[PDB]
Amino acid sequence: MGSDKIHHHHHHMFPYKIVDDVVILMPNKELNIENAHLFKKWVFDEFLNKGYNKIFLVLSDVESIDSFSLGVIVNILKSISSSGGFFALVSPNEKVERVLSLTNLDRIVKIYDTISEAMEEVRRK
Secondary structure: OOOOOOOOOOOOOOOOEEOOOOEEEOOOOOOOHHHOHHHHHHHHHHHHOOOOOEEEEEOOOOOOOOHHHHHHHHHHHHHHHHHOOEEEEEOOOHHHHHHHHHOOOOOOOEEEOOHHHHHOOOOOO
16 A cells, blocks of 8 residues: 555556466566556556466566566565465576575565476466
8 A cells, every 4th residue: 555546548468468366477578667656557457356376477588687677576476465366487597596685586486497387387386
């Protein structure tokens, strides 16, 4: 709870998909500051409030991220972890894995090779 909800209707085209009860948030080349505070605000009302307790982040289509949204990624985990859910990542390319140690990303949020290794195992991890 906090800050005023003021967001007119001007969404572009969200890069993600939905799975059986799971949500695959597949960013490409747009994780700039203007899609970072709002990123959580979209996820909260597209998925989290909607009932979704399992998000995944594929990093295949993205070489890296800025320090700004790098902390929003954790924040989305913190919210889920408090709500009853889990969130994990997929195809963590070696360029992110190098920063994902150094910023405690993997050391907080789960990591898998594929979606499938996650999708049945975040169920039990």
